[PDB]
Design a protein around this ligand. Sequence first.
Ligand SMILES: *Cc1c(COP(=O)(O)O)cnc(C)c1O
Ligand SMILES: *Cc1c(COP(=O)(O)O)cnc(C)c1O
Ligand SMILES: O=C(O)CCc1ccccc1
Ligand SMILES: O=C(O)CCc1ccccc1
Ligand SMILES: [Mg+2]
Lengths: 362, 361
Amino acid sequence: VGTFKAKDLIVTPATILKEKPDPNNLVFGTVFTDHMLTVEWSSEFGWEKPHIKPLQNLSLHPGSSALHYAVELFEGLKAFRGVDNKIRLFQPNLNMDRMYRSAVRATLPVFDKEELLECIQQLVKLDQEWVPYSTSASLYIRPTFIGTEPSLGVKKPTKALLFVLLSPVGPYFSFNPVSLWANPKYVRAWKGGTGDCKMGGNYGSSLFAQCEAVDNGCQQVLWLYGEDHQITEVGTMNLFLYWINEDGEEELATPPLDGIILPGVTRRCILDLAHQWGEFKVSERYLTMDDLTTALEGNRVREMFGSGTACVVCPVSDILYKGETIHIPTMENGPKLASRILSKLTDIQYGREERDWTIVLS
Amino acid sequence: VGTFKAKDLIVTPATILKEKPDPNNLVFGTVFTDHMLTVEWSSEFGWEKPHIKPLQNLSLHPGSSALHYAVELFEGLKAFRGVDNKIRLFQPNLNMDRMYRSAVRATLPVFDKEELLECIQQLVKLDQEWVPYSTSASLYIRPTFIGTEPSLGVKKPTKALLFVLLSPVGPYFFNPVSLWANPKYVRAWKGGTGDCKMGGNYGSSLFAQCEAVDNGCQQVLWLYGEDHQITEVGTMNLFLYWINEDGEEELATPPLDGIILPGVTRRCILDLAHQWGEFKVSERYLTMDDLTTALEGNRVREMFGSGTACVVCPVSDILYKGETIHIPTMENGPKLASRILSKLTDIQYGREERDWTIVLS
Ligand SMILES: *Cc1c(COP(=O)(O)O)cnc(C)c1O
Ligand SMILES: *Cc1c(COP(=O)(O)O)cnc(C)c1O
Ligand SMILES: O=C(O)CCc1ccccc1
Ligand SMILES: O=C(O)CCc1ccccc1
Ligand SMILES: [Mg+2]
């Protein structure tokens, strides 16, 4: 057991540089930077030294287990160029904590979280001119970790690769509210499954549901669970509901961490904000379609929104379910809370206000 | 171009051929033959021509969606060298049907099933001396299909690679196995993708499979629901031979309700067992309680797995809730299991005629 170490970094700088794109025209996940990070591991010898080097294709044995049995996991986080022109990461240690836990769930080897973070910082620092010059764009950071065992046995891999990609991305907006496809025939995650980790195999199974959703005029899938049709998540975002609850109290509600919900960083931040403001009840609790339709009949719903790293906050206007369109009155209610959370988090990400949630580049 | 064709195959033979392994030293899945099949697809241009070429690494964009969101799926079938020295496939059209259906569910591009089986046969023929000269060994064929979309959004890929590897194998692991049963982990769920061979179903199973080895088990027995239904034996279908609750002799296996892989072996064994008509045959739910109550009454004769890699794998023991639960499979012959193994191998190795085999092209 052990870890690679950032002090052993080997840097092979590119000698031909790609042109930076316009920050207003960026499509998500499609343009990549000049460099990547790579680190090899074998059970025989452990972790090899980390490399930063020019972006390149991966050379993989076709029997690699990432390709047959989904022995894989990823993370997502961002670097933000401040109004003061300092580049900041936001809650990055939470992503490392999650990554490590995911590795263990997947049977990939463990590593030292602080050491990975430092390696990420030096990567971003080398490609730092790729962090956009714009207050509603950013650099998305994709750490990825795959089994490369050359063998078709289903088992723990004895070889693996950890790598990191960088991709400048732009605003999810200029506030666009979404319609949701709620079809109970599909289930993202089950008790005793891996839905509370960022493991590749949770996502394969959902491209078909996203396609069905667009064919019916919807932008995202609302994931339902169990016999009472609990509402769990929105696409790949956590779900919040701002309403007057069944006892007539103003409440922010979100599903609890009971194994079928991914514990988002955004989710966490929001809950901490809500707790600290102390202005309404905050509840991690079960929410069903009927709870929801009953609330709508009695004018109790203020706002519904997704949260996650790509969107930050994503207002919901409509849910399609049992052959009908159910309107959600989010945009008619400001959306006051959603806009508050958005301006608070973006103020922090871009250094418009001080916070312990940000780290300035190393 | 909506589908590739076998007649466009481009064959690049290898310069130096590797030495074949010993048929009685084979570790499943570890030795590969001289050549592979590869077919590139893109949204814009459709399917490129298929190529048979030397086994090589794949060169993949690190953004490739197979690596991030498990946009991927596979199959598993076998070629068998006959006692008559004719090489045969076993119900391969069923694997093609299943691969196509799973592609549709993965949002991978569709392909002409016949043309793929033809390409596969041409790949086997070129590597035919790898089909081992032994009647307890075979050549494993591994069609595999991955998204190679170089962009990070979760979406239908606009680039894909279809490839086939071949691997000589003996057994997968009568060697009876012991099974680890921990209901804390679930393999697949209703409204999920457990009824197809998508790579995501296997990623999540690994932790449990390691936990099984830590306890001296060879496999995981997958349990489901609050009543602890017994679903599958690792990656094999599960069969139970017993006296049922109405006092009838019965072969039982879980029904195809979404959480169970519809194995080719499983379907053969049910056909055989209907054909013999010596005992009841039921696709029904079975629980750990059904099992332990039956054992207490000395009602259980045999329990075994069945899948391509291991056609019949008997089960002696299950570890559950801190106890070991002995299963008396090996002290009842195991007659049924042996009858089944002997018939399927008779067919697969050509000792009898059958509509389930196809002789190599
Ligand atoms: C990544 C992800 C989220 C959002 O998590 P953040 O850490 O806030 O970006 C939500 N749900 C699912 C299923 C996810 O994969
Ligand atoms: C492959 C597989 C089977 C049986 O497969 P065959 O087509 O009979 O080889 C059963 N269960 C699971 C989970 C599998 O992956
Ligand atoms: O970050 C989010 O809003 C959802 C998580 C996500 C983002 C990009 C690709 C896959 C998952
Ligand atoms: O054939 C089986 O019994 C299960 C299918 C399988 C075999 C080997 C590796 C992955 C899946
Ligand atoms: Mg045709």
